[PDB]
Design goal:
The PDB classes it as membrane protein. Keywords: rhodopsin, syhr, trapping, cryo, cryotrapping, o-state, k-state, sulfate, chloride, pump, anion, photocycle, ion transport, membrane protein. It forms a trimeric assembly. The structure is a homotrimer. Chain A has about 220 residues and is mainly α. Chain A contains 7 helices and 2 strands. Chain A has helices at about 1-25, 30-55, 70-90, 95-115, 120-150, 155-180, 190-220; strands at about 60, 65-70. In chain A, strands 1-2 form a two-stranded antiparallel ribbon. In chain A, helix 1 (about 1-25) packs antiparallel against helix 2 (about 30-55), helix 4 runs antiparallel to helix 5 (about 120-150) and helix 6 packs antiparallel against helix 7 (about 190-220). The interface between A and B is medium-sized, with 15 and 13 residues. The structure holds (2R)-2,3-dihydroxypropyl (9Z)-octadec-9-enoate (3 copies), oleic acid (18 copies), eicosane (10 copies) and chloride ion (CL) (3 copies). One oleic acid sits at the interface of chains A and C.
Chain lengths: ~220, ~220, ~220
């Protein structure tokens, strides 16, 4: 079960990469080129992640617990680009963009530590720390980020509501899966955990990528001369 | 002794993070927001460092020598932000800012190698290399950095004299502690070495953070219309 | 044989660093200062690489195969700066510069995995992936990069032809050496592989560095008022 889902991730991320790459190649306009390029690299990174996992790499048995450490290495690179999708579209200021990237980096880094710690009590402490770094991004997203985006696009508040809703709902599912997996309560087996992360990753990357493009289209139409 | 000092670091860095975070939240002005945000992340990173150390993590016994490797990983992230405190306040040019960040990164990276090398002769070679990278930053700080800062703030030369004096004196103490610790002559025990690095870290982060804010206030008053 | 070539690399990169550092120190002009500084750090990084290798570091025996992993860590830092040499001189747009840096990072990262994988079939898969990331940069260099550079310097097309020819020919030799070495067919011994990478590195760093400076001189003369 796990193995097929890892190849599904390879396929889905590769297809995402191909179609964003084609979009980048054909873009009319530097802003469109940038947005397609961000999403290309989000999916190209994840394609590499899923190939490594599908090939059996990136995994260690830590004190008897099979542990996939590689996803944190690539998530550390792909999730800031997803943040940049948001801050590019929202024309977010530098300190708020930096704060989002920094809090996100903190979330991924402490999630890594929460995962690889042999002492699972210590790991769960880092899980809480990582959750608070995520909550920091939630606060920044629904306050400063949203208010700046609505100031920049007064007629497109719904666009950013949808972007934020999709980001926030999907990203909250990751710490839930983590608690269900063998990092937490071990309520689902590895094949199911792998399926869950794969579906989340494809949706949060390919899916959010296409939503970001559709959002860009709506923003540009709203701000046509 | 070591254990209590690691928790003291957790507490001190957490408090620094809280008060710079409050400052960032209430900032009047993008430049103030940026400066508070830099210092928030300096202290938030170090809070994570000290929690990991306090929990017993980040340490390996290398050929019989207890070695804390984690501080180099986080120092690699927090010290460039301290450099950015300086270059933000000094409005330093891009090549000099890049040179400072690059020489600092070189210092931390070779300090890491100096620390983790099992062959302590090789480690001491890297110690000398790291000292020369530090001396490179000294040269850049007291020459190009200072001259640009004084050109940008002709009436605030004392502000940058104090910033530089505090930076240079405090940062020079780190390679001294390193020579006293079990990385060098082992003239102080681990508890004393831990106390020394903890006090240095709190002063160089929380202390320098507050000095950077006070410096900003003086600069803005000097340049009020 | 290997040992002498590693010290030759130390010497050659140190000399490159010294002369670009002198150039940076004496630069007339921010653009010249930037260009000298990029090349200084390219060579300073590689000086550290070669010192570590010369001292016996950065190497592991993986399943009986001596493997130098450290060169990928420093190449990950020095090769983007070589890309920046090109994009600085060509005044390349942000999405194309980002795409070049991203594809290059992908090349080095998957080259690392191709190298350290114990399963050499898996390693060779990553070799192909890395080759395609290189081919991506080739496409970007000879198309978007070149066309932008020629638009920015209509009278200096030959300058960028020479820069690109030297970059492309030299960088293609690296995956050839990799196939000849014990990562691939093991057609040359370690001393010869080490010599090959050392000569390539000195040429691609010190040599390309001096070519970039000469190119800058030609560009500025072509665009003198
Ligand atoms: C701020 C957000 C805090 C998050 C979640 C609440 C509690 C969940 C965190 C603690 C996880 C505990 C856990 O995984 O328990 C292991 C389980 O008992 C198998 O032995
Ligand atoms: C440029 C700055 C050079 C720095 C310091 C001078 C010499 C200090 C560097 C050498 C350290 C030697 C050391 O740590 O000695 C180990 C000791 O003998 C336990 O066995
Ligand atoms: C796109 C570029 C593809 C690159 C090269 C063609 C084939 C080379 C890649 C495969 C290498 C095979 C190899 O190294 O073979 C090991 C050798 O048989 C010792 O046992
Ligand atoms: C791989 C991506 C990692 C992202 C890490 C982000 C870290 C964010 C840290 C924030 C502090 C910096 C705030 C803005 C600094 C601006 C500097 C300046 O204007 O000179
Ligand atoms: C985690 C922080 C690490 C910081 C590393 C800093 C490396 C500095 C390297 C200097 C070379 C670059 C000099 C300026 C390049 C400008 C590029 C451009 O203008 O296109
Ligand atoms: C050590 C060097 C590593 C270099 C990695 C480069 C990664 C490139 C990724 C490309 C995606 C970003 C494209 C441009 C983003 C611009 C963001 C913005 O304008 O707000
Ligand atoms: C077998 C598993 C397949 C998984 C597919 C899921 C996601 C990636 C596909 C994305 C395709 C987008 C095409 C859009 C278009 O060009 O119209
Ligand atoms: C994975 C890599 C994807 C590369 C995509 C290349 C895009 C080619 C565009 C062709 C065209 O539309 O004419
Ligand atoms: C622990 C740290 C992770 C949370 C980071 C919070 C970022 C926002 C704070 C701010 O306003 O500067
Ligand atoms: C319950 C779940 C709802 C929380 C997630 C959605 C947040 C919406 C954000 C917004 O509308 O800007
Ligand atoms: C709202 C949704 C909340 C989801 C919460 C996830 C909790 C994960 C652990 C489930 C508890 C029982 C575990 C077990 O004993 O097998
Ligand atoms: C017990 C150990 C305590 C260590 C405390 C040291 C440093 C961090 C405290 C910083 C508090 C600054 C408050 C400034 C203010 O708001 O007036
Ligand atoms: C550690 C994290 C610190 C977060 C600080 C949050 C700042 C809240 C400001 C509240 C206020 O002043 O109204
Ligand atoms: C070894 C290298 C560390 C020292 C780096 C020196 C930076 C300043 C040089 C310059 O002017 O470009
Ligand atoms: C003896 C120690 C003094 C050296 C450290 C202080 C340097 C001062 C720098 C300055 O005044 O700009
Ligand atoms: C000026 C201050 C100089 C500080 C120098 C630090 C040297 C550290 C080592 C001390 C030498 C004796 C060590 C020993 O034999 O125990
Ligand atoms: C013994 C091995 C020596 C290897 C030397 C090779 C390359 C680095 C030398 C670069 C010297 C450039 C000097 C240019 C000048 O200032 O005229
Ligand atoms: C390796 C480090 C190299 C540093 C080079 C320093 C340059 C000094 C310039 C001296 C001068 O030209 O007056
Ligand atoms: C696999 C990925 C490595 C190749 C990256 C290709 C970069 C150019 C694609 C684009 O136009 O955005
Ligand atoms: C055969 C080798 C030739 C390919 C490498 C040279 C490419 C030249 C690029 C250019 O002229 O812009
Ligand atoms: C054009 C140049 C092509 C260079 C190709 C390199 C191939 C490397 C492997 C050589 C094949 C024989 C190896 C052997 O059996 O020893
Ligand atoms: C745009 C920046 C790209 C950076 C490189 C991303 C490449 C990801 C490839 C997957 C990495 C897998 C690592 C597996 C290691 C196994 C070691 C044993
Ligand atoms: C970016 C890094 C942030 C800190 C994460 C440290 C992880 C250390 C992992 C060590 C593995 C042995
Ligand atoms: C466009 C595609 C967005 C993602 C849809 C969900 C993918 C699930 C894969 C099994
Ligand atoms: C703003 C950028 C933030 C990056 C993340 C910093 C988080 C630091 C947390 C401490 C890391 C401790 C690592 C311990 C590893 C132990 C492994 C066994
Ligand atoms: C940024 C990195 C600079 C080079 C440092 C290399 C450290 C390698 C550590 C290997 C540990 C096994
Ligand atoms: C503001 C505080 C600056 C640091 C003072 C020194 C802290 C020492 C802790 C024991
Ligand atoms: C401008 C950015 C500079 C980053 C630091 C580069 C320093 C390179 C020094 C060589 C690293 C060698 C690592 C050897 C590790 C051996 C561990 C056992
Ligand atoms: C930048 C990193 C891109 C991915 C490379 C992952 C390498 C993981 C190596 C693990 C060694 C045990
Ligand atoms: C598109 C990147 C290259 C494909 C992966 C490797 C194909 C060869 C597998 C054997
Ligand atoms: C200027 C020097 C450029 C490199 C020439 C080739 C160096 C070969 C070293 C053996
Ligand atoms: Cl990923
Ligand atoms: Cl730190
Ligand atoms: Cl290098």
């Amino acid at each position: 079960m796990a193995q097929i889902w890892l190849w599904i991730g390879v396929i889905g991320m590769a297809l995402g990469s191909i179609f964003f790459g084609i979009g980048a190649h054909n873009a009319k306009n530097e802003r469109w080129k940038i947005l397609f390029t961000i999403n290309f690299f989000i999916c190209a990174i994840a394609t590499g992640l899923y190939l490594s996992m599908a090939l059996g790499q990136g995994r260690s048995v830590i004190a008897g617990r099979p542990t996939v450490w590689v996803r944190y290495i690539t998530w550390f690179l792909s999730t800031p680009l997803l943040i940049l999708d948001l801050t590019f579209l929202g024309k977010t200021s530098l300190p708020i963009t930096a704060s989002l990237l920094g809090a996100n980096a903190y979330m991924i880094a402490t999630g890594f530590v929460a995962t690889i710690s042999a002492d699972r009590t210590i790991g769960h402490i880092w899980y809480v720390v990582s959750c608070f770094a995520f909550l920091a991004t939630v606060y920044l997203l629904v306050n400063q980020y949203r208010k700046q985006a609505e100031r920049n696009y007064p007629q497109a508040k719904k666009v950013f509501r949808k972007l934020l809703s999709v980001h926030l709902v999907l990203w909250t599912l990751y710490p839930i899966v983590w608690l269900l997996g063998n990092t937490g309560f071990n309520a689902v087996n590895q094949g199911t955990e792998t399926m869950f992360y794969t579906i989340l990753d494809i949706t949060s990357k390919v899916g959010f990528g296409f939503l970001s493009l559709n959002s860009m289209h709506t923003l540009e139409k709203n701000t046509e001369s």
